[PDB]
Design a protein around this ligand. Structure first.
Ligand SMILES: Nc1ncnc2c1ncn2[C@@H]1O[C@H](COP(=O)(O)OP(=O)(O)OP(=O)(O)O)[C@@H](O)[C@H]1O
Ligand SMILES: [Mg+2]
Lengths: 49, 212, 49, 148, 198
């Protein structure tokens, strides 16, 4: 009967001393937004062997 | 002799960094994920080369820490080379409730499987429902639309805690999940039966927690 | 000395071991150790077959 | 049992080849010609048609063989011309079925020298049809055009 | 084991910092003397080190280094906004010949603001701020704010260096070429850059 009182009172009265934990939050790797793929179209022609 | 690994690096550290598990783990760790006993591969790896990893990461001005419960995590210093961030108060409410749920022997028979509804029911049983509703919307007074909005915010934050490694969803059902020991960090303000103010001061001094 | 005790008090693992008295905690830990050893013995016996 | 065989290889609008078809041999096929003629290019076209995984394809020079280089350029883009391109294989199955596998290749407009691949397969094609003619349209006086 | 030169490279005191930067997506140009020299010296091994993450270490033909993630990247990815590429292509255009005589390498925020407003079409500007906007002062103020914001993002990427004072005047680095057009034999850079901006 040790933690019941210990933890319940903390949740019940949290807003009298609100506190927050710290975490590692390394940056995301920025990349180019992919533009719509634009292929090369040229209607090539030539003499057939 | 020259051109010899020992000139630049300890053999055990190089051996660790050359392992196939390292990139995954590194990536994750940097992202803030906690590592518990269930993910054997990772955990075991951590255990094997603990001191080398600690020494390594030290270069970055970050502590690789081991909680008593057996879970590893990253704590940045003030001079950290890697950014540091803080959790939201709703995340704390869900965190402390997940902690009480883990301890509860009354629900141990579930074999760790809990449902979002049970979590929500426990939370409203303990905290001030109508006063907590203030965070969802400044005009909330117990309306069902606002109650569903609260449930959806809980659903969202719980998903963030999953990315942090604090809870694992079932393989085929997303309405049910399992806890891990990493949740005990939410009890860092009460694990010792002493003056709350002094504890809080100690924690902020150690870089564990910030006020709001 | 006080400092030492204070230091240690935080380092307790979970509820069944929440004897706020470190020295008292020791034995509990060791109990766990013995428990674990028995479980390991049974499991390795299963593995053989 | 009769083992399957590769009948032929076809290239369209590659660097130096407009529309050419090599007929493979049952045992050995040899390519000869002075430096820069285009032999290694033919090899590259074949392997590309076999494994279109663009993450893997990396055509180093024969010199510098075996050196894991991570070169900026994989060396495929330059072997293609502007417009649409093809590379196809004709195969006779052990069941004596004619099947034509291949890929459509096309350069990507933009600073990065990237390439696009779209595989395809044809079954049941009559034995009288040649891939060179199937992939081109006769426009003008013997001045054929390639078709997407 | 591990290659000796790779162990040497990552043992160097400059590595942690550069690692941190690179993972963020920053581009290393010829300006950063020590970092650039370090990469030049240990490229052959750093490329292998980062390949283990399914991320590519590329040296641009102009000379600057940067990382390109694959689809299977081990590093969490993130993507720029449309307005970001618009501004980037504008900066690429400003890396012009008369620039040398016009500004001696040092620009101001207003140059970019006015160039952006003059050269882009109104429809995509509205799409940038908000479709409900129409030629109003508050919309232009919001667009200015967004321009400053994205310019700071680009400064993070290393594209643009702010002169060390509170005022918003800057210089453009060579790495801006990453936004640039494809170059064909004999083509004029101004024309091709404008052709893409259109
Ligand atoms: N990626 C490329 N970009 C530009 N030109 C290329 C490219 N690859 C090959 N070439 C050119 O295409 C021509 C054909 O080269 P290829 O290697 O196929 O010839 P080859 O007959 O096999 O020569 P060798 O026997 O000397 O290897 C040569 O002029 C070569 O310079
Ligand atoms: Mg060749």
């Amino acid at each position: 009967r040790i933690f019941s009182q210990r933890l319940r009172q903390s949740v019940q009265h949290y807003f009298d001393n609100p506190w927050t934990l710290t975490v590692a939050n390394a940056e995301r790797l920025l990349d180019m937004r992919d533009e719509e793929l634009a292929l090369r179209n040229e209607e090539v022609t030539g003499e057939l062997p | 002799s020259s051109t010899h690994i020992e000139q630049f690096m300890p053999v055990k550290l190089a051996q660790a960094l050359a392992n196939s598990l390292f990139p995954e783990l590194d990536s994750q760790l940097r992202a803030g994920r906690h590592i518990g006993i269930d993910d054997l591969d990772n955990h075991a790896f951590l255990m094997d080369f603990q001191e080398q990893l600690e020494e390594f990461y030290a270069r970055y001005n970050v502590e690789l820490i081991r909680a008593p419960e057996g879970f590893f995590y990253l704590r940045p210093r003030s001079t950290t080379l890697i950014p540091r961030s803080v959790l939201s108060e709703l995340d704390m409410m869900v965190g402390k409730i997940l902690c009480y749920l883990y301890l509860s022997p009354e629900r141990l028979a579930n074999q760790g499987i809990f449902t979002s509804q049970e979590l929500y029911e426990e939370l409203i049983s303990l905290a001030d429902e109508g006063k907590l509703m203030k965070f969802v919307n400044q005009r909330s007074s117990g309306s069902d639309l606002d109650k569903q909005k609260l449930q959806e915010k809980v659903r969202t934050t719980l998903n963030r805690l999953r990315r942090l490694g604090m809870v694992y969803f079932l393989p085929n059902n997303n309405n049910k999940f399992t806890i891990t020991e990493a949740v005990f960090r939410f009890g860092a303000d009460v694990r010792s039966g002493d003056d709350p103010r002094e504890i809080q001061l100690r924690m902020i001094r150690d870089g564990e927690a910030m006020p709001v | 000395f006080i400092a030492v005790y204070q230091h240690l008090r935080e380092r307790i693992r979970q509820d069944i071991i929440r004897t706020d008295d470190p020295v008292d905690a020791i034995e509990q830990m060791e109990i766990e150790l013995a428990r674990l050893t028995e479980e390991l013995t049974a499991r390795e016996q299963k593995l053989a077959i | 049992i009769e083992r399957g065989k590769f009948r032929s290889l076809t290239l369209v609008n590659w660097n130096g080849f407009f529309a050419r078809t090599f007929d493979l041999d049952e045992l050995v096929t040899t390519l000869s010609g002075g430096n820069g003629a285009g032999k290694s290019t033919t090899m590259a076209a074949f392997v590309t048609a076999l494994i279109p995984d663009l993450t893997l394809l990396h055509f180093r020079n024969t010199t510098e063989a075996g050196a894991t280089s991570g070169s900026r350029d994989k060396g495929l883009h330059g072997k293609l011309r502007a417009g649409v391109c093809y590379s196809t294989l004709d195969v006779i199955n052990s069941r004596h079925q004619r099947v034509v596998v291949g890929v459509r290749l096309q350069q990507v407009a933009g600073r990065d020298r990237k390439v696009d691949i779209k595989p395809f397969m044809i079954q049941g094609l009559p034995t009288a049809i040649q891939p060179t003619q199937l992939l081109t349209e006769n426009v003008g006086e013997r001045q054929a055009r390639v078709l997407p």
